[PDB]
Design a protein around this ligand. Sequence first.
Ligand SMILES: Nc1nc2c(ncn2[C@@H]2O[C@H](COP(=O)(O)OP(=O)(O)O)[C@@H](O)[C@H]2O)c(=O)[nH]1
Length: 582
Amino acid sequence: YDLKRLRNIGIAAHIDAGKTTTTERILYYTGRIAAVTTCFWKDHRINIIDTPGHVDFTIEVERSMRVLDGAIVVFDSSQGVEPQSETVWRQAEKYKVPRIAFANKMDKTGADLWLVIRTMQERLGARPVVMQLPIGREDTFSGIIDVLRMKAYTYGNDLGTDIREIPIPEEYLDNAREYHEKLVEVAADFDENIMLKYLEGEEPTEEELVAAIRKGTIDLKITPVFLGSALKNKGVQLLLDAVVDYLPSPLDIPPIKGTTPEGEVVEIHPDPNGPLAALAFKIMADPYVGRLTFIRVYSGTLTSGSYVYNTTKGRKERVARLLRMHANHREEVEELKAGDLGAVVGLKETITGDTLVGEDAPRVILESVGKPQVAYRETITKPVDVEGKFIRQTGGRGQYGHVKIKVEPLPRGSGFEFVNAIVGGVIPKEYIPAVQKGIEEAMQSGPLIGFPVVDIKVTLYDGSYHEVDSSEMAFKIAGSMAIKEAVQKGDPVILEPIMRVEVTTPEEYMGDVIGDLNARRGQILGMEPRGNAQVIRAFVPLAEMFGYATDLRSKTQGRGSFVMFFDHYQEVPKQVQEKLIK
Ligand SMILES: Nc1nc2c(ncn2[C@@H]2O[C@H](COP(=O)(O)OP(=O)(O)O)[C@@H](O)[C@H]2O)c(=O)[nH]1
């Protein structure tokens, strides 16, 4: 265990760009010596954190980004930068996570390195550095030129069983020659001594270059780009050498922030010999060990067969075993130091997102079929004074329940309030519970659209009863009926949820999106930057947002993105109410 030799990476890519094939291929070359698979490359341990299938599911994505250190963005070189690529690309920036790119499918028809380099700076605002040059196109792609070391590689087949270093062929000797010089320029921007050498026509050393490019890559200023064909086993190991050469180690990135029990909010460093701070990010019920809980250790060591405190749930837990998932097998270990990750068997209360610390350690908390229908709520507007009355011969015996209540509207969000104002026993004390229950039962489904009635204040103040005919049932119905008429005669109004949205669209559609929203009864609050895109935010009724995704696309070329969360309830406009009633 060396902290510098760890590489926690994620593989982000638009659907079909080749995340699976790339990942699988990596496990194959890494192997011929799962939330978090592990493997080795040149004495480095690479932990491949699995990333969310659809980048749209925000919650998971930001968690993933948070647990991984570096990332590999995979592109389909016949398509260039795609929509999901942008989404996941803004996300990475949002979390300052170093990247490198892989131009996959260089064997496919239409595959072109330059389409990717261009689209990258065009759409994403990136400053790509060409690190390799292909040798051949589509069906003839067969080699790779390493522009930084001036080396060429040829693959004798699509099986990955033949690779030879060759001299840079003559037809590419000039092309490679200038990109090397361009490479040296970029490096010079991060290493003063390289510039001096550049100015006086002196070739810097690979170490200098690699170091410089690495520094740039980690600082989030450049983006090394590599290419190959996963499906045809071309470039895979060079891509692995890249992850070691440029992606960061737990040490190269900014410390994670923790909010303690007082809010002093302090940073926690990857010290193996310091308090134990860890986070569970994915739970999976394994069939051989039952319930696996994956975690990322930020600080201190976690040992097998020990106790840990789950600072989020207050609970306490026993760490039975510590497992490591490899390509084709499991491995059991006595520990997991800081900056490392693995599975933990034993936890019972810990769920996705919870923080775990050592027993005697700083209690810090690292984180905080039908058709889809809206959650409506009914309520009233003016105070009312009605009466419930159930009187009739049902079941041989008479029935008689009579209640008089005063219902009055309460401040939005005040809830419910019941008052017993009866006196002189006009209603037998034994029936009050019946009356109350009839009321809370009828509030479950309002008379306007059948949704829970809310923010009202009921007050039982009168009624009558029969010596023999009264009964609990009678007073339950009468209380029920009373409330129903209370809501009908109280100038009722439907309330609806108002979400606060967040739409990120390149300023090219600016006025288009902020125009469609208003068509959904929204209300623009403000705007701001976020790279090449603009972040629009407003209050849109949840009813108007159904299917917004397959709408924002056909109005942003799929380059649009949004997230929304409940904000408050508000009375629907008279027009909209009238409609709903139908
Ligand atoms: N020709 C070619 N096609 C590829 C390559 N990598 C992936 N594909 C194909 O792309 C499709 C999607 O692959 P996949 O790895 O599942 O991508 P994902 O959907 O991002 O996980 C499959 O049909 C692959 O066989 C490549 O380097 N060359």
